[PDB]
Design a protein around this nucleic acid. Sequence first.
RNA 1: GAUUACCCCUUCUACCUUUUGCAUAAUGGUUUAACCAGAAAAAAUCUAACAAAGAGAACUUUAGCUAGAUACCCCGAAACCA
Lengths: 48, 224, 109, 123, 76
Amino acid sequence: XXXXXXXXXXXXXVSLANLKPNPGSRKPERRPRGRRRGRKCGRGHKGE
Amino acid sequence: XXXXXXXXXXXXXXXXXXXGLTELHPDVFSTAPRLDILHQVAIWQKNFKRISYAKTKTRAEVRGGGRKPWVQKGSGRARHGSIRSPIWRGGGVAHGPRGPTSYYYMLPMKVRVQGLKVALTVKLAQDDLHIVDSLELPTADPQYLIELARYRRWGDSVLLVDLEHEDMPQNVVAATSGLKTFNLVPAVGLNVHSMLKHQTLVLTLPTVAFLEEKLXXXXXXXXX
Amino acid sequence: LFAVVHFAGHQWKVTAEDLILIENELDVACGERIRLEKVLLVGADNFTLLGKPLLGKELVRVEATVIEKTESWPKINMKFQKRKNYQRKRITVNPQTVLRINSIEXXXX
Amino acid sequence: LRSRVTDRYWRVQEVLKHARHFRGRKNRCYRLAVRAVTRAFVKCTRARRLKKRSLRTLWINRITAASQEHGLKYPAFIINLIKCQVELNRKVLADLAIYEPKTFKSLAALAKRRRXXXXXXXX
Amino acid sequence: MHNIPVYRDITHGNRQMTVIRKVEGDIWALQKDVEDFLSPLLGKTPVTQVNEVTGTLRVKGYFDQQLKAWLLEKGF
RNA sequence: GAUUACCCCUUCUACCUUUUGCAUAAUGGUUUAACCAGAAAAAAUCUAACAAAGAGAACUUUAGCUAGAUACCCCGAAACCA
């Protein structure tokens, strides 16, 4: 059913630029830089 | 059981002939092509080719000495250690690439195999895949190949997989000489990277034979 | 002879030929002619009519025309908290509508 | 390896572009420009919040004046307008208190009329 | 070979969910049949299909015995 | 904000750090440019491969196994030893 629906429409021939991962495949790695968590990078205030 | 029937057009490649008939049964075809697998295979193929030659020098690897530039207190200046410190403009970086590594990894056989299979399915159903009985290049000149690609209205980029690499000089000589459009590669050297690199695929009968043999044996080994 | 209307929760003093900007969109196509209610009416003969909590629909009328739907100059709204590391910057553009008052109708009862 | 390139210089250029007309280093230096910009925006919000208050107070003063010209005070006029079912805003009421003394005179007359009728009905 | 895939999925340590994979025919009809079959037994029909390039049938409960029996007797 | 193509009037107690609490007469900064300080996957969550099997002769396994993707930053001594 998906083969007929993929063969029916004319696509962009799927160039390497058209390659995309499935949703939730790779995590958007968190970077400590920002005003989200200030200056402590999630380590809290002082302490060891 | 659904049997896919693909028409193989035999071209004598001289000129003005699109006429040929052979009945092919590519059981290798898949219903829905996996984009995720293809992407992972491409990323991996890009990954193991990395040289990882990026280098730097941590403060310990700096030629500079570890002597204290001045007294800790009373100097009026800021507290400072060796001048090779990253806080100094004469120092390096701590988190830098200097420590080497290997960006490659071991990908399961079924994944890469299903990758090549799915890619082949993509090229198949995209009409960009054509099957021939043989290949002939009697004149062996660039002009002939160009005018052939223009007259027969082939794709902008065509990957030719025909030879077993052990024969047929007349073709290879002209095909491997100064041609950006067409690319050459043996039937046993066929890979997914080469297929995804080009917008059009052209295979011959022995090539399709060995390919379907390898892919049916790998699919049968993965199913069992 | 001038009138006082009410729209978008705001009351305005309207006169003939006047151009008045009202908040956001009236859901009316440009070029169309619309009618407005009347909070107050004052005639220049010093004759005033004030109904409550509204004026006569049959007695008096107000008709104006919409020129276009514009947007006011962007306003920068920023919230800042001291040593809380809290800063929020938001640029807000207030939508507006240009109304051209044409006919103020007054009839005798 | 990346580079600082034009990013920081463009951000500074933007802040300083918003720092124009400022006095001294604040229209020149970047840091003082930012420090002045934050205060400028806070003051923008606060003054835009208190603008309604200032205008309201001004209008109340004007209406109080125009009322006192007729012999009655502002609160009595407000009460009379409330019992007269008049929802007219103080802005338009002040505009009438300036340009159109006749309407305000009529409203004041009706105010004194309602006040005298209430004081006569209570007795 | 073995008849049909059967996926027992664990979302957490003590929590269990059932997962089926597409085999033969379209998923929609079989899903409707699953709903109609599980409706009298379970009392509800919490059937959900997740389709990307293939498909996954997910329901709330354990029908796996009836699942295997069904897909056996049917032959799909 | 008003106001004039400029200003007076009205509305407001620097930043940062450290703190129960700082415009604080607590801390750091002449200004500007540039340099400068979160790089580790076991178990887990998640995306895919196959499934009583996964994984490129090595291990796990009463739905597992394999692969990928997700979290633990710098500067500073007084001194010791050769």
